[PDB]
Structure formats: C-alpha cells, structure tokens
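Task: complex structure prediction.
Instruction: return structure tokens for all chains below.
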Amino acid sequence: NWEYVMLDTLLFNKGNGNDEEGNENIDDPLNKQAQRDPEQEQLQDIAQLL
Amino acid sequence: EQEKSNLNIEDDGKKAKEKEDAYFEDITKNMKQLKTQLKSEYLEKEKANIQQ
Amino acid sequence: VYKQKIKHLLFQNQDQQSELKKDVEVTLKQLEDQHRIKSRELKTDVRSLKVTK
Amino acid sequence: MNPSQTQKGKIQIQVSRGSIDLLVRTMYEDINNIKLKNERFQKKKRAED
Amino acid sequence: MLAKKLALARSQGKPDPFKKDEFPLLQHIAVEVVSQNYILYPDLKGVPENVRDTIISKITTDLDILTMAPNIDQESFWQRACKNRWEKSQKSINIEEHGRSWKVAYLERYMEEFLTNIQNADDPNKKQILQAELKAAASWIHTLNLQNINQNIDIDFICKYLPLLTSLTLTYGTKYSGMDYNKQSVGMKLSEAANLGEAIKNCYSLLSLNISANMIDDDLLRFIMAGVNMNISLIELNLSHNKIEDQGARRIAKFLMRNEILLYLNLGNNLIGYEGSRYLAQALKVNKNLQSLNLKLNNLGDKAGKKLFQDLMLNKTLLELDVSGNQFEFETALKLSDYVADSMCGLKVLNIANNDFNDSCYENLKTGFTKNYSLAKLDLRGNKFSKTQEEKEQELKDPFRMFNLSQTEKELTQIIIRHDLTAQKIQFFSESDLDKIKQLKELQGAKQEPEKVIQQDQNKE
Amino acid sequence: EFKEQENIPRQYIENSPKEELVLEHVIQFKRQFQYQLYYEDKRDLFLYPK
Amino acid sequence: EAFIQMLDKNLDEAEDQFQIALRNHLIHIENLMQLQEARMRGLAEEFNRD
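Output:
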C-alpha cells in the first residue's frame, strides 16, 4: 500500500542491540562461527545507503 | 631475472593494495559501529527522555 | 657486444619492472583516493548527525 | 572545564609531531649509504686508474 | 540504413515493426558520421558545439596530432588518447605533471616519442611534419622528455618553432645499447652539443636546462655556453651524469659573474676539483642569484670545499648546498660549522654526507649547527663518526642497516631538529622524551590498577 | 526580499556534496517510481521545493 | 705489451660498463627513493588531513 523513497540503516543496525539480559552462562563461544553472508555484505557495500 | 623482478613487483603491489583495503575496511567498519551508535541510539535516547 | 646487450636488455627488464611498479603505484593511489573520499563523506555524516544527537 | 578538553587539538598536534619525527628518522636511517659507497668507490677507481 | 528495413517491412504487409519511438534522427546520422570521420570536420564548422563535443569524445583515442591538437579542444578525447596509446604502456600519464591538462600532456608525449624515435631526424618529409606539428602545438607544448637520443636532432630548430618551451631535458645516448656497443653513439657529440647551445641561444622562453647523463666534457660545456651567453631566460642548469672538468667549472664561474638570473646549478657527478670549486667560490663571491648548488660525485677535496665555504661566507645567497661526494674531513667540518653557525648563513638545506668527517668533526660541526638556526634539512649519513658496538651489531645483522646513522649523527641531526622546531613553533620529542612518556603512561596504568580493586572490595558487606 | 538580503545564510544558497547526493538519489527514485507507475495519475509528491 | 695495453684499455671499457651500470643503478635507487618519498608524503597528508 505504501512505499519508501529512501534507504536507511536503523533496521539492519538495531538487530544487535538485544544484549540486555546478559548475566548468565558463558558457554563455549567458538561454536558461534555462523557464515557471514557474502551476498548481504556485497549488497550493503554496493547499495550504500543514501 | 626479469620475470622474477616483475612478479616481485606484482606481488608487492598486491600486498600493498590488500593492506590498504584492510586499512579502509577496518576504519570504515569502526566508524560504521559508531554511526550505528548515532541513529539507533538517537531513537533509544528519545525513548529514554520520554520515560524520564 | 653480448655483455652490452645484457646491460641493455636489462634496459628491457628495467623498463617492464618500472611499468609494473608505476602501475602498482597508480592502482594504490587511486584505491587510497576512493577510500579517503569515502572516509570524508563518512566524516561529514558524523559531523552532521551527531549535531542532531 | 578540562584544559585537555579545550586543547585536544594541541595534544594531537604534538602526537602527530612525534609520529612525523619517528617516520622521518625511520626513513632517514634507511635512505642512503650504498650511494656513499658507490660514489666513494667511483672516486677510488678514478684515482686508481 | 533504416530505409531498407522500412521498405522490407512495408513490402510484406506485416504490422509496422517501426514503432514511432524507434527512429534515430538526421541529426543522429550526421553526428555518428562526423564522429567516425572527425578529420572531415576537425574544427566542426557549421555544426552545434554539442555535436562537436559528441563527435570529439566519440573519436578513437589514436587520432593524428596535427588534426587533434588545433582542432580538438576536448580534454576527454585528449585523455582517452593518452591512455589508450599509453594506458598499458610502460610510461604512465599523470595529470599533475602537465599543468592539470591532458591535451598538452598528450601533445608533449607525442613530441617526445617523435624526437626520441626520429629515424634520420633530418628527413625533409619529417621536417615538414615536424614544422606542422610545432605550429599546431606551439602554444600548447612547453617541455619535452627525450630519452637516449640516438641521432643528432636539431635542438635549435626544434626550439625555433615552440615559443612556449620552458623546461628542456636532453640525454643523448643509445636507447638501444644492445647489439652494438659504441661509446660515441651514447651522449651528445660535437654537433649535438653545438646544436643544443644554438637552441639555448635562440630560445627565449626556456627556464630550465637539464643536459645531464650526456657525459658532457669541457668542450661540450663550452659549446653549449657559447649560445647560452646570449640567452636571457635560463634559471636552472643541470649537468650531472657527465664529465665536465675544471675548465668547464671556470667557464661556469665566468657565466655566473656575467649573469644574474641563474638560480639552480647542478654540477655534480663531474670532474670539478680543487681549483674548479675555487673558481666556483670566486664566482659566488660576487654572485647574488644562485640559490641551490650541487657538486656531489665531484672531486673537489677538502681544500676545494674550504675555498668554496670561505667564499660562501661573503656569498650569502646560498640556500641549498649539496657538497656530498667530495670527501671532506676535519678542517672542512670546522669551516662548514663556522659558516653555518654564522648568523648570516642563509643556507637552508645542506647535504654534506658522502664526506670523511670524523669524531673531531663532531664537536666543530655540532657547535656550528647549534649556533646556526637557519638550516632546515641536513645530510650526514654514512660518515665515519665513531659508532657504538650496538650500531655495529645492527649493521652486521642487517646489511641495509649500514644505512643506519650512528648515534652521534643522530644527535647532530636532532640538534638542527630542535632548531627548526623552535623556528616553526613545534615541540621536539626526543627519544628519551618519548621513552619517558611511555613509561609515565605505563606507571599511570599501574597506579590506576589497584584503585579499582580497592573500590570493588568495599561492596561485599 | 530574503533573497535580496545582502547576507543570506549559505544554507539557503547551495547544495552540499551529501545534500546533492541525496537529491540525485531521490530524483532517481522518483524516476524509477514513474517508470514503474507510468499509468497511475502523477501525484505531485512535493519533495524538492525552492 | 700491446696485448697488455689491451688488458688495460679493454678492461677500461669493461670497468666503464661496470661503473656505468653502477651509475644507472644509482639512478634507479635515487628515482625509487623519490617515489617512496612521494608515497610517504601522501601518507603524511592523509595523517594531517585526518
């Protein structure tokens, strides 16, 4: 129904602001090596937000 | 000897360009974190002002 | 004559080496220019939006 | 009102001065002694011949 | 060509494939034709400049100089030609080096190629083409870079048709010193030197002359100076990589005392000796225009250098002095130290490396430099000053560490470092100062470490 | 008369580099919007006034 | 003794090749130093402008 002219950074940069409850288990971190998306990184670089 | 010098120059230039790319990407990502610490925190700070 | 052609023909080796070094220098210089232009646009963004903050 | 807050610029100018002094000497101690050797040997061979 | 397609479409009774939004105009056809045949309209008379620029920027990047220079004013075309002809060529093209314009850069590069590879440079047809090119790019060529001049090219004739020449650099030699080893084929011969001198004499817009690497002897220098005497625009002269002897030095001194425009003099890598530099200093005694002089790779000697400095005390216009390669020693260090410490010593950049200064030179030179506050940059690397076993081990461990200045040379340079820093309002951060700053930061961190623990220990009750 | 002012602020005079970048990006967005909605009645989304 | 003059003068030419190769190599080094100092000045300008 509605479209947006401009491209912003808030939506994709507010995802990591969830570190609120952290007071607990420090379990093994090396298992959190998920694959960073090359397509997403290249899209972010090429379509640099105006 | 010419091929050795040519490949030395090419690989040194590749090292230089990769170092400069790492430079640029590192500083750019550092500021990108800082800039994400401008807009998102701007909205969160408006929320905090309202609540206070 | 052959020792000369060696000293020359090191003329060719030198010329190709200089070509490669100068191409490397120009590529690095233009990459640095691109990076620095990006950095300056970014520092403008900083100076501009921290004002609103 | 921190004097450091007011003259952060003067702090960083001194920092850049130190960095420039470091770089100048780092390159200076690497620049030229083979040229000295070559010129002196050129004069040596001039005299010898 | 679209007419044929229209006829074919209409001859079969099919719906018109030529939608009205698909027809290029007569302007389109004419613009494409002129772009492909720009030589037809090099000035593009009778056509809008929009079409002119479209055509010129669509042109191939390999147009003839005679038609591209006076007829194409498009920097886009000029730079495209520069690149495509030299994009992957061993010689790169820098905008900063041609007054920030690509057209003049292309013109001068093409002139350099033409002269450097001019086979039988005196061909009548080649002279006709050269005159046409010189007329086309005269207001548009100011300097040339010719390397390893393989033939006697008429320097005077070339200068006669380029009124805006300002810098000239000639290095006669064999661009291909391969299958044929000839000593006379490398460097300017008698005729080449005479032609260079005649060009200098008949050129009024030239300011810089660099005829180094020509093995220039006294005879060549005198032949050049024969025409140089009537020239009134030369400000810089360079004769390095040559064999100019003390007779050439005397001739240069005569030219200097009779002349009042030369500012940069490069006489290094020459046979100038004691009495040659004595003539140099004698000329400098009355000289008041020379600013930068280099005699590196020469053979002046200690006495020659000291005569030069004793005349320089009165010759106060010296700002750049490269006296390296002449192997100065203790009394030279004494006299140079006195000259620099002289409050009227106008020298700003001094290169006295390559000499034989010793520890006894240390005290005199240090005193002179400390009393002097004008010098800005100095060269003293490689001197025979006593070096500690630490520096000896460093040099042994790194053969390129022989380049390393001895510690004493370090303090000597750092003295002028404080001098310049005080002159231009900047603090000197010595080695000890920086080490003390780092230690202070470390101690500050150490002292701040236990306060946090003490504060944390007070919240368990 | 504000334009007649002898000392108008520069903010009312020129488009900065970033401002012109955003202007061009928004112009391209408008071009794409018209491209994708040839037929829909052109509604003056008055984004760039003098 | 003319053959000895040959070892003298022909070796003079050989040592002239030696010394001119050294001369050209010094030219290479001095030109390389200028380009490296251009790189250094670019990096410094980067430092100072930042």
